Design an enzyme around this catalytic site. Structure first.
Site, PDB file in Angstrom:
ATOM      1  N   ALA A 143       0.862  -1.172   0.000  1.00 22.02           N
ATOM      2  CA  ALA A 143       0.000   0.000   0.000  1.00 22.02           C
ATOM      3  C   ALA A 143       0.903   1.226   0.000  1.00 22.02           C
ATOM      4  O   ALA A 143       1.240   1.786   1.050  1.00 22.02           O
ATOM      5  CB  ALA A 143      -0.892  -0.018   1.206  1.00 22.02           C
TER       6      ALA A 143
ATOM      7  N   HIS B  25      -5.990 -15.260 -14.963  1.00 25.82           N
ATOM      8  CA  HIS B  25      -6.390 -13.881 -15.227  1.00 25.82           C
ATOM      9  C   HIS B  25      -7.813 -13.868 -15.790  1.00 25.82           C
ATOM     10  O   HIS B  25      -8.123 -14.630 -16.721  1.00 25.82           O
ATOM     11  CB  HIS B  25      -5.422 -13.280 -16.237  1.00 25.82           C
ATOM     12  CG  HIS B  25      -5.491 -11.789 -16.367  1.00 25.82           C
ATOM     13  ND1 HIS B  25      -6.600 -11.122 -16.849  1.00 25.82           N
ATOM     14  CD2 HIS B  25      -4.556 -10.841 -16.131  1.00 25.82           C
ATOM     15  CE1 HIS B  25      -6.346  -9.823 -16.890  1.00 25.82           C
ATOM     16  NE2 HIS B  25      -5.109  -9.627 -16.468  1.00 25.82           N
TER      17      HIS B  25
ATOM     18  N   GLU C 189       4.006  -9.100 -13.782  1.00 22.23           N
ATOM     19  CA  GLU C 189       3.108 -10.133 -14.276  1.00 22.23           C
ATOM     20  C   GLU C 189       3.732 -10.890 -15.440  1.00 22.23           C
ATOM     21  O   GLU C 189       3.541 -12.104 -15.566  1.00 22.23           O
ATOM     22  CB  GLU C 189       1.785  -9.513 -14.703  1.00 22.23           C
ATOM     23  CG  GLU C 189       0.759 -10.505 -15.159  1.00 22.23           C
ATOM     24  CD  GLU C 189      -0.571  -9.845 -15.386  1.00 22.23           C
ATOM     25  OE1 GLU C 189      -0.816  -9.336 -16.500  1.00 22.23           O
ATOM     26  OE2 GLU C 189      -1.375  -9.847 -14.439  1.00 22.23           O
TER      27      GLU C 189
ATOM     28  N   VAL D  28      -3.713  -4.758  -3.420  1.00 23.42           N
ATOM     29  CA  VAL D  28      -4.479  -4.146  -2.342  1.00 23.42           C
ATOM     30  C   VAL D  28      -5.811  -3.533  -2.804  1.00 23.42           C
ATOM     31  O   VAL D  28      -6.715  -3.370  -1.991  1.00 23.42           O
ATOM     32  CB  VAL D  28      -3.652  -3.056  -1.606  1.00 23.42           C
ATOM     33  CG1 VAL D  28      -3.520  -1.768  -2.452  1.00 23.42           C
ATOM     34  CG2 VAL D  28      -4.263  -2.752  -0.218  1.00 23.42           C
TER      35      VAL D  28
HETATM   36  O1  LIG Z   1       1.159   3.683  -6.504  1.00 23.07           O
HETATM   37  C1  LIG Z   1       1.063   2.467  -6.309  1.00 23.07           C
HETATM   38  C2  LIG Z   1       1.057   1.553  -7.365  1.00 23.07           C
HETATM   39  C3  LIG Z   1       0.949   0.182  -7.101  1.00 23.07           C
HETATM   40  N1  LIG Z   1       0.842  -0.297  -5.775  1.00 23.07           N
HETATM   41  C4  LIG Z   1       0.749  -1.750  -5.450  1.00 23.07           C
HETATM   42  O2  LIG Z   1       0.950  -2.566  -6.639  1.00 23.07           O
HETATM   43  C5  LIG Z   1      -0.264  -3.324  -6.881  1.00 23.07           C
HETATM   44  C6  LIG Z   1      -0.444  -3.460  -8.401  1.00 23.07           C
HETATM   45  O3  LIG Z   1      -0.720  -2.229  -9.012  1.00 23.07           O
HETATM   46  P1  LIG Z   1      -2.241  -1.918  -9.556  1.00 23.07           P
HETATM   47  O4  LIG Z   1      -3.215  -2.536  -8.596  1.00 23.07           O
HETATM   48  O5  LIG Z   1      -2.316  -0.463  -9.831  1.00 23.07           O
HETATM   49  O6  LIG Z   1      -2.245  -2.747 -10.948  1.00 23.07           O
HETATM   50  P2  LIG Z   1      -3.599  -2.983 -11.763  1.00 23.07           P
HETATM   51  O7  LIG Z   1      -4.456  -3.982 -10.910  1.00 23.07           O
HETATM   52  O8  LIG Z   1      -4.331  -1.703 -12.014  1.00 23.07           O
HETATM   53  O9  LIG Z   1      -3.192  -3.773 -13.100  1.00 23.07           O
HETATM   54  C7  LIG Z   1      -1.353  -2.510  -6.171  1.00 23.07           C
HETATM   55  O10 LIG Z   1      -2.476  -3.354  -5.843  1.00 23.07           O
HETATM   56  C8  LIG Z   1      -0.630  -2.110  -4.904  1.00 23.07           C
HETATM   57  O11 LIG Z   1      -0.492  -3.249  -4.045  1.00 23.07           O
HETATM   58  C9  LIG Z   1       0.855   0.628  -4.711  1.00 23.07           C
HETATM   59  O12 LIG Z   1       0.765   0.242  -3.544  1.00 23.07           O
HETATM   60  N2  LIG Z   1       0.969   1.990  -4.991  1.00 23.07           N
END
Ligand SMILES: O=c1ccn([C@@H]2O[C@H](COP(=O)(O)OP(=O)(O)O)[C@@H](O)[C@H]2O)c(=O)[nH]1
Ligand SMILES: CCCCCCCCO[C@@H]1O[C@H](CO)[C@H](O)[C@H](N)[C@H]1O[C@H]1C[C@H](O)[C@H](O)[C@H](C)O1
Ligand SMILES: [Mn+2]
EC number: 2.4.1.40
Length: 290
Positions: free
Chosen positions: A61, A171, A241, A150
Site C-alpha cells: 500500500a 487472469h 506479471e 491491495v
Molecule cells: O502507486 C502504487 C502503485 C501500485 N501499488 C501496489 O501494486 C499493486 C499493483 O498495481 P495496480 O493494482 O495499480 O495494478 P492494476 O491492478 O491496475 O493492473 C497494487 O495493488 C498495490 O499493491 C501501490 O501500492 N501503490
C-alpha cells in the site's frame, strides 16, 4: 508427522458423476484447478488445522493506495482463511496511514516500512525484491505466503483449498483465450519472453503464492530477471506479471486458482461459469490514484 483425520460424515464422491463438467478441473501436469464444487472444505480445513497451518498475506500500500487497506483488511477478516492462523504483512511508505482494523483471534498484522518508487511500474515490480532477499522473517513466521494486490475486496470464501507448494491464478480476461492472444512478453530480448507456440495459461500478477520456500524462489528469480532486463534497457510489457508468467511456464504450479479468485465485476460481469465471486477488483481511477 501427520495425524489421522477424525470420523467425518459427508456425501460420497461419485466416480461416474463428476462435480463440474463445464470446466477443466486438472491441468495436464495433474495440478488441480480450483473451482466451486471441486472441494469439500470440511475435509481440507481438518487437514490444514491438524498441521497448525499459518498463512502469511503480503499486500503493498504505497502512496495513494493506502486508501484501499480498510476495505481490503475488513473483508479479509470475514473471508480469508477464517479459523486458521493468519499473519498480514502490510508494506507501506506511510505506517501512520494504515487503518486500525479489528482482527479475529489467531490473526495478526505487521506494518513494514518500505521506500516509495516514483513510477507505478517500479512500485508494482519491486514487490518481487521486497518479498524475496529483503524479508527473512517469513521462514520463521508462516507456512505459506499469499501475495495479492491491495485494490481489492473479499466477497466470499478464500480458504485452505488454495494452499499448495506453488500456485497461480487465471487472469479473468484470458481464461477463455487462445495462447496467441495472451499478453505475454513477446520480445526475445527480455528474460520474460514467451513465443506464440508456448504457454499454458495467462496468470494474474495480483494473486499468487505457495510455501515460503517456493514463493521466495519465485520472487528471487523474477527480481533477478528484472535486473537483467533493466541492464539490457528493456522493461517487460506487463512488468512483474510478465515475469511471473515466464516463471510459471517453466516451473509448473501445483494448483491453479480459477477466476473466482480474481474477478472484476464492473469490467466483466458475472458469467455462468462462476458460481462464486470471491476476491474482486475495487473500481479506481488509474491516472489519479497512481
Ligand atoms: O502507486 C502504487 C502503485 C501500485 N501499488 C501496489 O501494486 C499493486 C499493483 O498495481 P495496480 O493494482 O495499480 O495494478 P492494476 O491492478 O491496475 O493492473 C497494487 O495493488 C498495490 O499493491 C501501490 O501500492 N501503490
Ligand atoms: C479497462 C481496463 C482494461 C483491463 C483489461 C485487462 O486487464 C489488464 O490486463 C493486463 C494484461 O493484459 C494486466 O494484467 C493488467 N494488470 C490488467 O488490468 C487490471 C486492472 C483493471 O482495471 C482490471 O481490474 C483488470 C481485470 O486487471
Ligand atoms: Mn490491482
Amino acid at each position: 508427522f501427520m495425524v489421522s483425520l477424525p470420523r467425518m460424515v459427508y456425501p460420497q464422491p461419485k466416480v461416474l458423476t463428476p462435480c463440474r463438467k463445464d470446466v477443466l478441473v486438472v491441468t495436464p501436469w495433474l495440478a488441480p484447478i480450483v473451482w466451486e464444487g471441486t472441494f469439500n472444505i470440511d475435509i481440507l480445513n481438518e487437514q490444514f488445522r491438524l498441521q497448525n497451518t499459518t498463512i502469511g498475506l503480503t499486500v503493498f500500500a504505497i502512496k495513494k493506495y493506502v486508501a484501499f487497506l480498510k476495505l481490503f483488511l475488513e473483508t479479509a477478516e470475514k473471508h480469508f482463511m477464517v479459523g486458521h492462523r493468519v499473519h498480514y504483512y502490510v508494506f507501506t511508505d506511510q505506517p501512520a496511514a494504515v487503518p486500525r482494523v479489528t482482527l479475529g483471534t489467531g490473526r495478526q498484522l505487521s506494518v513494514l516500512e518500505v521506500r516509495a518508487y516514483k513510477r507505478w511500474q517500479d512500485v508494482s515490480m519491486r514487490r518481487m525484491e521486497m518479498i524475496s532477499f529483503c524479508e527473512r522473517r517469513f521462514l520463521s513466521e508462516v507456512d505459506y505466503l499469499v501475495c495479492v494486490d491491495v485494490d481489492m475486496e473479499f466477497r466470499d470464501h478464500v480458504g485452505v483449498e488454495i494452499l499448495t507448494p506453488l500456485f497461480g491464478t487465471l487472469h479473468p480476461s484470458f481464461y477463455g483465450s487462445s495462447r496467441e492472444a495472451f499478453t505475454y512478453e513477446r520480445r526475445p530480448q527480455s528474460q520474460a519472453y514467451i513465443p506464440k507456440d508456448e504457454g499454458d495459461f495467462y496468470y494474474m500478477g495480483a494473486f499468487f503464492g505457495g510455501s515460503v520456500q517456493e514463493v521466495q524462489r519465485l520472487t528471487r528469480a523474477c527480481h533477478q530477471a528484472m535486473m537483467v532486463d533493466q541492464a539490457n534497457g528493456i522493461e517487460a510489457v506487463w512488468h512483474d506479471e510478465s515475469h511471473l508468467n515466464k516463471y510459471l511456464l517453466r516451473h509448473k504450479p501445483t494448483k491453479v486458482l480459477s477466476p473466482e479468485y480474481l474477478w472484476d465485476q464492473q469490467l466483466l460481469g458475472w458469467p455462468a461459469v462462476l458460481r462464486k465471486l470471491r476476491f474482486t477488483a475495487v473500481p479506481k481511477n488509474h491516472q489519479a490514484v497512481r
